[PDB]
Design a protein around this ligand. Sequence first.
Ligand code: FDE
Ligand SMILES: Oc1c(Cl)cc(Cl)cc1Cl
Length: 134
Amino acid sequence: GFKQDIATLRGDLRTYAQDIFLAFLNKYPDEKRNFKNYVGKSDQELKSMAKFGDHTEKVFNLMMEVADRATDCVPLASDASTLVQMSGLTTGNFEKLFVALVEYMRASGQSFDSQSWDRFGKNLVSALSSAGMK
Ligand code: FDE
Ligand SMILES: Oc1c(Cl)cc(Cl)cc1Cl
């Protein structure tokens, strides 16, 4: 289930981080509105851009840290606070990333606990809102 998933994602974090963030960008083409430098690039061309690999990996690492400290897929309010205080982002964009993550898990042949990820995303979004993210 959820804890084992974090370990599975950690064991190939750079490739899962890139492949899930590409699933997100291709499901929600308008989210490139927020990535001037990714517009007009295929998956292969993004995978050659240093900050593509290094940003996606840092984001998923942080998500894994928040997931690892969560109880029953509920993140720490402290963690939400820290995230909101870390330039312009929304709970809607986070929600979409999680929808992409869960669909990516469901289509894998691996026993990902996709329902726990869906609950975790819904609880992180609510935590961010409660901590003052628009
Ligand atoms: C959808 C989504 C999701 C997400 C998630 C996340 C998590 C968990 C964490 C995070 C963090 C962050 N962000 Fe994050 N995210 C996103 C998005 C984003 C954007 C769009 C930005 C900026 C804008 C531009 O310009 O690109 C960011 C951004 C961000 C940041 C800053 C940048 C760098 O420096 O790297 C940080 C730190 N993000 N993040
Ligand atoms: O370059 C970025 C990527 Cl690939 C993902 C996110 Cl969430 C943020 C940035 Cl700045």
